[PDB]
Amino acid sequence: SPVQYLRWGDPAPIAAVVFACLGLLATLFVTVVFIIYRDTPVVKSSSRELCYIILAGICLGYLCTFCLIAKPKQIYCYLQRIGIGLSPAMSYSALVTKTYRAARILAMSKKNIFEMLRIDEGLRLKIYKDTEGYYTIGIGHLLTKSPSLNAAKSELDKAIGRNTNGVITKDEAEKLFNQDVDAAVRGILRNAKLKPVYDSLDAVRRAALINMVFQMGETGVAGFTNSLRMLQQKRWDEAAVNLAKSRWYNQTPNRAKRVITTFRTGTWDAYKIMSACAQLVIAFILICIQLGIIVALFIMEPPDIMHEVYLICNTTNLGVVAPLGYNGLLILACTFYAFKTRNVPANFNEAKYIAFTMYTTCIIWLAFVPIYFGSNYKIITMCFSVSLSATVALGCMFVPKVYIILAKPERNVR
Ligand SMILES: COc1cc(/N=N/c2ccccn2)ccc1NC(=O)c1ccccc1Cl
Numbered sequence: 001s002p003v004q005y006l007r008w009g010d011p012a013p014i015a016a017v018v019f020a021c022l023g024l025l026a027t028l029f030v031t032v033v034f035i036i037y038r039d040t041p042v043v044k045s046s047s048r049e050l051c052y053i054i055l056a057g058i059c060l061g062y063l064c065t066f067c068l069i070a071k072p073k074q075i076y077c078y079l080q081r082i083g084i085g086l087s088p089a090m091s092y093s094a095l096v097t098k099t100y101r102a103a104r105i106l107a108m109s110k111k112n113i114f115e116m117l118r119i120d121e122g123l124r125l126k127i128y129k130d131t132e133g134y135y136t137i138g139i140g141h142l143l144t145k146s147p148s149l150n151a152a153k154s155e156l157d158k159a160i161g162r163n164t165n166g167v168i169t170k171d172e173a174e175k176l177f178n179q180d181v182d183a184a185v186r187g188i189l190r191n192a193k194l195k196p197v198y199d200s201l202d203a204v205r206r207a208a209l210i211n212m213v214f215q216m217g218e219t220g221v222a223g224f225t226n227s228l229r230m231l232q233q234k235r236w237d238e239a240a241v242n243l244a245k246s247r248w249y250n251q252t253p254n255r256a257k258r259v260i261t262t263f264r265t266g267t268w269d270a271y272k273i274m275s276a277c278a279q280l281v282i283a284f285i286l287i288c289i290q291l292g293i294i295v296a297l298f299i300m301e302p303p304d305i306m307h308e309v310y311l312i313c314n315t316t317n318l319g320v321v322a323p324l325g326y327n328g329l330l331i332l333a334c335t336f337y338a339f340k341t342r343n344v345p346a347n348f349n350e351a352k353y354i355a356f357t358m359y360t361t362c363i364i365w366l367a368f369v370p371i372y373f374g375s376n377y378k379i380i381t382m383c384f385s386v387s388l389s390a391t392v393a394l395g396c397m398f399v400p401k402v403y404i405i406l407a408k409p410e411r412n413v414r
Contacts, residue, residue, distance in 0.1 A: 001309065002014040002016075002017050002069060002309055004309075005309055012377070012380045013069050013309050013310075013380075015384075016065050016068075016069055016380065016383040016384065016387070017065060017066075017069060019065070019383075019384070019387045019391075020062045020063070020064075020065035020066065020383075020387055021062075023058075023061070023062035023387055023390060023391060023394075024059065024062045024063070026391075026394060027055055027058050027059045027062065027394060028059075029402075030055065030394060030398045030399075030402055031052075031055050031059075033402050033405060033406070034048070034051060034055075034398075034401075034402075037405045037412075040405065040412050041412060041413060041414040042347070042348060042401055042404050042405055042412050043401070043405070045346070045347045045414075046098075046347050046350060047097075047098055047101075047276070047279055049276070049279070049280055050094040050095075050097060050098050050279055050280075050283060051094075051398075053090055053091075053093070053094040053280075053283055053287075054090070054091050054094045054095060054393070054397070055398070056090055057087050057088065057089070057090030057091030057092075057094065057390075057393075058087075058091060058390045058393055058394050060083055060086065060087040060090060061083075061087040061088070061091070061386050061387065061389065061390030062386075062387060062390055063083060063087075064080070064083035064084055064087060064382075064383070064386045064387075065383050065386070065387060067079040067080040067083055067311070068080060068084075068310075068311065068379050068382055068383050069309055069310070069311070069379075069383065070311040071311070072305050072307065072308065072311055074303070074304075074305070076311050077303035077304065077305060077311070077313035077314070077315070078298070078303050080303075080311070080313055080315070081294055081297070081298070081303060081313075081315060081319065081323075082294060083386075084323070084382065084386060085290055085293070085294050085323030085324075085327065086287070086290055086291060086294065087386065087390070088327045088330070088331075088386075088389065089286070089287050089289075089290035089323075089326070089327060089330065090287055091390075091393055092327065092330035092331055092334050093283045093286035093287045093290075093330060094283045095334045095338075095354070095358075095393075096286065096330055096333045096334045096337065097279045097282050097283045097286070098279070098354070099333075099334055099337035099338045099340075099341060099354060099358075100333075100337050101274045101279065102337065102341040102344055102346075102351060103337040103340045103341050104274055105274065105344075106340065106341050106344055109203060110174075110177075110178050110181065111174065112204075112207060112268060112273065113177075113181055113207045113210060114139070114173075114174045114177045114178075115271065115272065115273045116207050116211060116262075116268075116271055117139050117177070117211060117214060118139065119258075119271055119272060120211055120215075120255045120258065120259070121139055121140065121214060121215070121255075122139070123138055123139055123170070123173055124136075124137060124138065125137075125138070125167060125168055125169065125170070125173065126166055126167045126168075127143070127149065127152050127153070127156065127166040127167075130142075135149065135151070135152030137156060137166075137168060137173070137176070138168065138172075138173030138176045138177060139173060139176075139177045139180065139214075140180070140214075141173070141176040141177065141179070141180055143155045143156055143159070149166070152166070153165070153166050156168070159176060160172050160175070160176075180214075181210060184210055184213050184214060185198075185210065187213070187218050188209070188210070188213060188218070191218050191222070193222040193225070193228065194209070194213070194218060194221060194222065194228070196232060197209065197228050197231055197232050200231070200232045200234070201231065202266055204262060204266045204267060204268065205231070205262065205263055205266055207262070208259050208262040208263050209221070209231075211259050211262075212224075212248075212259060215248075215252070215255070216248065224242075224243065224246065224248075226242055227239050227242045227243045227246075230242060231263060236263060236264045236265075236266070237264060239263055239264075240260050240261070240263060240264045243256070243260050243263070244256075244260060257270075258270040258271065286330070289326065290323060290326055290327070293322050293323050293326055294323060297318065297319050297322060297323075300318075301314065301315070301316050301318070301319050302314075303315070310379045310380075311379070312379065327365075328365065331358070331361055331362060331365060332362075334354075334358050334361075335358040335359065335361070335362055338351070338354045338355045338357070338358040339355055339358070341354075341355075342355035348400075348401070348404060348411075353396050353397055353400055354397060356396050357392060357393055357396040357397050360392045360396065361389060361392060361393070364385075364388060364389050364392065365389065368381065368385045372385070
């Protein structure tokens with residue numbers, strides 16, 4: 001009885017049980033809220049089905065405390081090992097599936113910009129110089145400002161990760177172009193004239209603005225004050241009419257016609273250019289791998305009480321460390337794809353929060369390695385550890401969305 005341990009001068013059990021219960025309530029609230037408001041654009045935009053798996057994971061994370069603070073029965077040693085290994089595996093298998101898909105969507109998004117400017121500006125697959133005289137390759141990608149061609153080859157090889165002999169492929173030029181886009185988009189957001197326009201525009205019309213920036217630079221695109229304001233107000237037909245009067249249109253009419261037409265339609269029409277049930281099956285597989293590890297260890301080192309509210313089991317270091325390792329890989333993958341997609345604005349900046357969640361989760365899990373092994377109160381540290389990691393995931397991912405559903409029904413709009 002955790003109440004008895006409180007009476008005696010030990011409040012750790014009762015704390016753990018309370019943390020866990022507030023956890024379950026909060027998860028039950030968040031869940032029933034997502035069911036009720038499933039039709040709205042803040043739940044329907046993301047993967048509704050993966051969230052249920054993430055919430056089950058969080059839920060089961062809180063339920064672990066009821067097998068760690070338990071009566072000495074055989075099955076609770078079985079459920080301890082299932083819960084402490086499978087609850088994070090449910091949350092992060094679902095999450096890594098979500099973040100990987102965001103990353104593939106981001107990659108395929110950057111491919112259109114690249115195809116756009118391949119057609120508009122060109123591409124050389126072997127080293128050349130710009131009109132200054134500095135070594136360049138692909139879509140005007142700068143290598144070095146050194147007169148040494150070897151330096152250019154040197155920095156190219158580093159940039160790609162093979163000996164290129166100064167020659168690359170379309171896909172390695174794409175890779176290089178994505179640095180130059182990110183660079184150009186940083187300049188734009190540092191620039192008070194361009195920043196509000198880029199903010200306003202959909203993905204396709206941002207491609208159009210980056211194109212112009214790539215042709216005339218930032219200070220040049222800031223020239224088009226009126227045209228820029230027309231686009232901000234989403235006045236497409238009038239922005240086209242105005243830009244079609246420019247020195248820009250009269251000096252490079254072929255490229256200008258295409259960029260302008262793209263500002264009108266918000267489509268790719270002017271240029272030559274990941275499932276749902278898949279994510280459940282992949283998430284389910286990634287989770288059965290963790291089950292395989294736990295069931296394997298149940299045969300190698302069968303669960304058994306050691307022999308009292310702290311239920312102590314025989315679980316050896318390999319019983320702890322094997323699932324820990326796999327959970328760690330899941331976390332590191334999640335963090336990797338999350339960070340890759342951190343600035344993706346889709347679904348009310350879902351990506352910004354997920355990145356923050358994963359950064360926290362890394363410091364927590366890495367912290368609780370020396371803490372747990374260095375500790376003589378392992379069942380308690382395990383209790384607070386699981387619940388904390390689960391609260392972080394619920395806190396940083398689900399609260400921000402439940403907030404908008406409940407507090408800001410007006411902003412809950414596509
Ligand atoms: C960070 O602590 C843990 C959290 C766990 N679940 N979190 C959850 C669970 C559900 C949803 C989100 N998050 C599971 C095991 C944990 N710890 C360990 O298994 C462990 C054991 C020994 C040494 C170090 C560690 Cl890190």
